[PDB]
Structure 1
Amino acid sequence: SNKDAALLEAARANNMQEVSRLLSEGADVNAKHRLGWTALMVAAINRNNSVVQVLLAAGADPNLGSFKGCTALHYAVLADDYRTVKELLDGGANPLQRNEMGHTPLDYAREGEVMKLLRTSEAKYQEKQRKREAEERRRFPLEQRLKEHIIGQESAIATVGAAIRRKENGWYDEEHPLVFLFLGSSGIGKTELAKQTAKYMHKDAKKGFIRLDMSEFQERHEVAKFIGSPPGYVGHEEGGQLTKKLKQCPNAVVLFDEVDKAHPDVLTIMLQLFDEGRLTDGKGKTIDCKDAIFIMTSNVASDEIAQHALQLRQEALETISKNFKENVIRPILKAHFRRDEFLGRINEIVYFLPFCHSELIQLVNKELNFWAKRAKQRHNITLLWDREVADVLVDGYNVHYGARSIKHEVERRVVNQLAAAYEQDLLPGGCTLRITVEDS
């Protein structure tokens, strides 16, 4: 504890020797004084450029929070010393950091070298971040990330990626959220695509992905879950759940899984959300989510979508459907979703088509790779197969389930055999299996 006080006193007195001795002895570089200032901070206010430099080289943090709450950069600007401001900025100081009073390094000092340094640091940071992010996106676009997991559905991936890129590059109106409606048969990756998109946007934030299941909303009064009860009713003080989640992460990705299962008057609450990204809870607080992304998944027109997809498979063949027939898909949606204004607010309608033979083979290969890696990681068993296995597994495909049919087929026909053999201790650790078309 004495080391921190000694370092603070040395920094206040501009004692280079004492500051260096304390730092080399393990003294807290960001030591805090009882008055609320640190060694780097009091060095900054006292125009101790050398002390500030040595403290920064020792690991001083200039962004740590009357001048109460003013950081090291704030005090450097207060002294109107440009050398200290430049050194702190080179050390990672934020030129726009704020104190308890809200003052910033860009306000304390008069126009001059300090302002120039702060502005240049801010501009260079912003430009570097912009260029780096753009280059990263170019190098590894969203489409490749989705293709890592999603198989087929090229049109849907292209549409979603185009919309997302248009949003990220700033070429989007901020007055209206972006809304998607995923349509297609069951078990073809709609909610999977939504999950992948949410992960891409908010990879390191669970709060960034808000999931709803509209099976849990199959009656009119279920709207009270979204915004909570009005004043004087049970649960009022709680407030809306969806409103809470949106307030936590305004730019999150909201997924209304199986929206078709909602009562139609539950969708009415979505009008303001989809138009202006505005929603009011039971307490009257209004949530602004203009930059959020809304995804709705349903299979309302599944049969018609499959029939259309046959168009590609109806070709004389001597892949991409124009799908102007959406004019006759609209009546189905209107019949289910009874309000035209609801559909009008949807930016894009994404159609997922049934898998082709090659896509089915790819799915089977994906499943067998997953199982092989699981076996290697768990029991250290190598697992291998040929075309005959993929084709035999595909032959058991069911249209009504898609990827789920493939999963069940692989599990039943192959995984059961691996489990039975393992339980019989016929699989020594490190051994290799070929599935030599093990059938019938």
Structure 2
Amino acid sequence: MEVTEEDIAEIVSRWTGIPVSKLLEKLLRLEEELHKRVVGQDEAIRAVADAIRRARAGLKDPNRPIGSFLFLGPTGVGKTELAKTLAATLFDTEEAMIRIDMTEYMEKHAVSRLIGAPPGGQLTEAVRRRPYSVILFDEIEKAHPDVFNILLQILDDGRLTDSHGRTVDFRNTVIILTSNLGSPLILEGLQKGWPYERIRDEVFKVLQQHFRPEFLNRLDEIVVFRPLTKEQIRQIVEIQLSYLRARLAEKRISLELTEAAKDFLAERGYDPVFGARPLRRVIQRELETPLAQKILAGEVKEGDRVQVDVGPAGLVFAVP
């Protein structure tokens, strides 16, 4: 009890470079740990956990990354949240997530930005100093063909060569590729009033053009994220209020939102175009702004429990 297991692990982790979570059973309950931050998207969470279990059981090729995934579906429904959460659970921190925006690698000479200029990179140096990391490639269809070839090398041998010719090890990484292809086209067809078979057939040809079977066969799983239900959005709202409540808890102030108040923020904080991205500024504008005035005015004080309900002209604040 005096010297804990984390005490020993942190010594070993410092000398070896292996993260504490890897050194320290918990893979059996990996899905419930990811669900603490990621609401819904059960299929994506199952797929990720299953792949990680195959790797650790010694069932997969050792000369490859831990796992590789393609995440399809719309914007703002949990793709990045899962990647960040995966990094925190597996590698102890969100700093262990490396993000590559492929919109910045569309113009031919972008390969030198990835692996470094010729004798005359961002990804290579990043992974060199963090072997244990989650790498997120966003908007993968935007990538230049030559840039796309470098990604296939990582999938094929779990390593990568840079400018000098020296290798960078990718065997301890998790690769997540994300794309939005098809989702805007569906919204276009629904607004234009196309029948279903029109929308369905047009999505498959667009996916066919960009994602060929030679590429997809290298991946562990292809997962399509779905839009969030009204129930699930209410859970996001409750998660997003966490930091505010912790700030208010220092002055012993409670925020009891009524059921209609959560629906108010949920209706404005979510839409099919941007997903739940607008929610942060909706909370800031509709809740945090008028609450700040109440506190500054002297209506809300130390120890007061506040009821948040909805009338016309936005949210109303009441005290017992």
**Range of TM-score over shorter length:** 0.7 to 0.9
Structure having the higher strand fraction is 2
Q: How does 1:216-255 map to 2 (within 5 A)?
A: 216-231=104-119, 233=120, 240-255=121-136
- What SS is found at the alignment partner of 2:59? coil
- What SS is found at the alignment partner of 2:40? coil
TM-superposed deviation, 1:330: 5.5
1:185 aligns with 2:74: yes
1:147 aligns with 2:35: yes
Shift of the 137–271 alpha-carbon distance from structure 1 to 2, 3 Å rule, reads closer
- Distance in 1 between residues matched to 2:260 and 2:169, nearest whole Å: 55
Q: How does 1:233-312 map to 2 (within 5 A)?
A: 233=120, 240-303=121-184
- Distance in 1 between residues matched to 2:89 and 2:245, nearest whole Å: 26
Aligned equivalent of 1:349: 222
Q: Over residues 264-299 of structure 1, what are the superposed CA-to-partner deviations in whole Å (9 max), with x where a residue is unaligned?
A: 432122111111122111111122323421111221
1:392 to 257, 264, 271: 264
Q: Over residues 136-184 of structure 1, what are the superposed CA-to-partner deviations in whole Å (9 max), with x where a residue is unaligned?
A: 433xx22111110111111111111111222222222213322111111
Aligned equivalent of 1:118: none
Aligned equivalent of 1:160: 48
Give the TM-score normalised by structure 1: 0.58
Structure whose alpha-carbon radius of gyration is higher: 1
Q: Over residues 302-328 of structure 1, what are the superposed CA-to-partner deviations in whole Å (9 max), with x where a residue is unaligned?
A: 247889xxxxxxxxxxxxxxxxxx998
Shift of the 144–285 alpha-carbon distance from structure 1 to 2, 3 Å rule, reads same
TM-superposed deviation, 1:202: 0.7
Q: Over residues 197-231 of structure 1, what are the superposed CA-to-partner deviations in whole Å (9 max), with x where a residue is unaligned?
A: 1111111583x432222222231111101211111
Q: How does 1:23-422 map to 2 (within 5 A)?
A: 134=25, 136-138=26-28, 141-177=29-65, 178-203=67-92, 206=95, 208-231=96-119, 233=120, 240-303=121-184, 331-337=205-211, 340-377=213-250, 379-396=251-268, 397-422=270-295
- Distance in 1 between residues matched to 2:38 and 2:143, nearest whole Å: 27
Shift of the 137–279 alpha-carbon distance from structure 1 to 2, 3 Å rule, reads closer
* One-letter amino acid matched to 2:182: A
* One-letter amino acid matched to 2:42: E
Shift of the 414–399 alpha-carbon distance from structure 1 to 2, 3 Å rule, reads same
* One-letter amino acid matched to 2:207: L
- Matched-pair identity in %: 38
Q: Which has the higher contact order (CA 8 A, sep 6+)?
A: 2
- Distance in 2 between residues matched to 1:401 and 1:408, nearest whole Å: 13
**Structure 2 unmatched ranges of 5 or more:** 1-11, 13-21, 189-199, 314-320
Are the equivalent residues in 1 in contact too, given 2:139–2:178 (CA < 8 A)? yes
Aligned equivalent of 2:317: none
Shift of the 274–284 alpha-carbon distance from structure 1 to 2, 3 Å rule, reads same
Are the equivalent residues in 2 in contact too, given 1:399–1:405 (CA < 8 A)? no
Are the equivalent residues in 2 in contact too, given 1:306–1:353 (CA < 8 A)? no
TM-superposed deviation, 1:418: 0.9
**Higher deviation after alignment, 390-399 or 275-284:** 390-399
* One-letter amino acid matched to 2:306: L
Shift of the 369–305 alpha-carbon distance from structure 1 to 2, 3 Å rule, reads farther
- Distance in 2 between residues matched to 1:156 and 1:291, nearest whole Å: 20
Are the equivalent residues in 2 in contact too, given 1:305–1:351 (CA < 8 A)? no
- What SS is found at the alignment partner of 2:214? helix
Q: Over residues 86-109 of structure 1, what are the superposed CA-to-partner deviations in whole Å (9 max), with x where a residue is unaligned?
A: xxxxxxxx9xxxxxxxxxxxxxxx
Are the equivalent residues in 1 in contact too, given 2:85–2:94 (CA < 8 A)? no
**Structure 1 unmatched ranges of 5 or more:** 1-93, 95-129, 234-239, 308-325
Shift of the 398–152 alpha-carbon distance from structure 1 to 2, 3 Å rule, reads same
